[PDB]
Design a binder for this molecule. Structure first.
Ligand code: NI
Ligand code: NI
Lengths: 100, 66
């Protein structure tokens, strides 16, 4: 019951980089997972670094990341860059500080 | 693998069906700063899949992963 019954699982996550405060931006305007491909909506902010670009970045250090907008699955560069960071799931997890 | 050391993601859409529960190894929550809410399920085959946290099966599965 909604939407696909028994096709491919779909739900391709899009890798993101974040700014210093955690705001995420996708690094590719299309993602493949199994037989599925998804394109981000036209006009979405993107960094033109690719998934492999992101996987190459040292986690949690600043890079200058070229900014674009998605258009038919492709990130088209503008003239601007933003500092961005690769975070992994480990960086977001658990609660090892508390205050009394 | 470790899956915890793979990059954070956001979801634009969600899997269309309930994934068999015994096939799910772990989950991650996408950032509240993403454009849409998203739970990522990690299957036993290391696939990361977007799911809609408003769906009952999703909460149940999250809860059952203790
Ligand atoms: Ni500490
Ligand atoms: Ni204490």
């Amino acid at each position: 019951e909604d939407d696909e019954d028994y096709g491919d699982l779909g739900g391709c996550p899009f890798l993101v980089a974040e700014n210093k405060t955690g705001y995420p931006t996708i690094v590719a305007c299309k993602q493949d997972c199994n037989g599925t491909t998804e394109t981000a909506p036209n006009g979405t902010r993107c960094f033109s670094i690719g998934d492999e670009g992101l996987r190459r970045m040292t986690a949690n250090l600043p890079y200058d990341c070229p900014l674009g907008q998605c258009s038919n699955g492709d990130c088209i560069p503008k003239e601007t860059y933003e500092v961005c960071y690769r975070r992994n799931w480990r960086d977001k997890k658990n609660h090892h500080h508390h205050h009394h | 693998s470790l899956a915890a050391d793979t990059p954070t993601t956001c979801c634009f859409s969600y899997t269309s069906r309930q994934i068999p529960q015994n096939f799910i190894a772990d989950y991650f929550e996408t950032s509240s700063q993403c454009s849409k809410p998203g739970v990522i399920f990690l299957t036993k085959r290391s696939r990361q899949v977007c799911a809609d946290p408003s769906e009952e099966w999703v909460q149940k599965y999250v809860s059952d992963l203790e």
